[PDB]
Amino acid sequence: GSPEFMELEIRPLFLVPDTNGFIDHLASLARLLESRKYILVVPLIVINELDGLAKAGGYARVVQEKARKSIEFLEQRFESRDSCLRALTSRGNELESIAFRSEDIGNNDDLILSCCLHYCKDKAKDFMPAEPIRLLREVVLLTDDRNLRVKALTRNVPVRDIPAFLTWAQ
Template identity: 30%
Template structure:
């Protein structure tokens, strides 16, 4: 009852300076990434080296398997379990194909990856590269670096990159102005 008598309004305006896109952002939403880059200096796109490495691999595409043993080998190499399935009935004219092994999908992803790499290499002022340690590099110097370290998934490396970028940028700015750090945890 007491709480309903008084109202405290708190507006929080989040103004991110660094945006760290992952590989899927470049493959699926390159036009949006380009629009964000045009908003420079409002935003700075910080591209993890692991994302560039993934894009370079995807740009090469995959060779479609030509027979069942090739499909099985591809799935095993990707860590996908292979279970024997009964042969389809003769009346079945359509064969279900896993998208990850669909040659048309692979071509589409390869082309999108090439376009993303072209965008990254254009030396746009809104785009910088960042290592997993949070070191910032120009796009021209980071395309051939190998981001090595512990055996982590690429998603974990991208997250580590973002966290180290935040950590490094806040340490640099602490002496410049009154610094307030809020740690927000979002749960979905």
């Protein structure tokens, strides 16, 4: 051996967007959900951010309208019991309903990352080969934000911007 390092077996199933993803790319997120190829897992904190944006003129009005469209989309799909859409709290609980939702209780950025990390609980034995040390990653963080991207890269969470993911997913 040369010195050991971890590698990722990347096989996307759970996709985790940030708030900007809804504001800028709602149509793409909807197309992904309609594909049935993926489970979109929305952090509760992202829903909280969207609700705060939704409630003006100018830029405030622009973002308000986009946040309202995002909430209307999420509420409709959750009420239809869309099997490819989930919500996840900071403490690891999956929601099938977002009616009467609460504020998720250390940045908002840390909470989104923890949501991703809910899908990469590695056990001690996964690090012992019988070869590459390789670990399964079924989650992808969908973001254009440099801060989150670097957080994800350093914490072993696959990461891609929405436009490129949609293209790659065909």
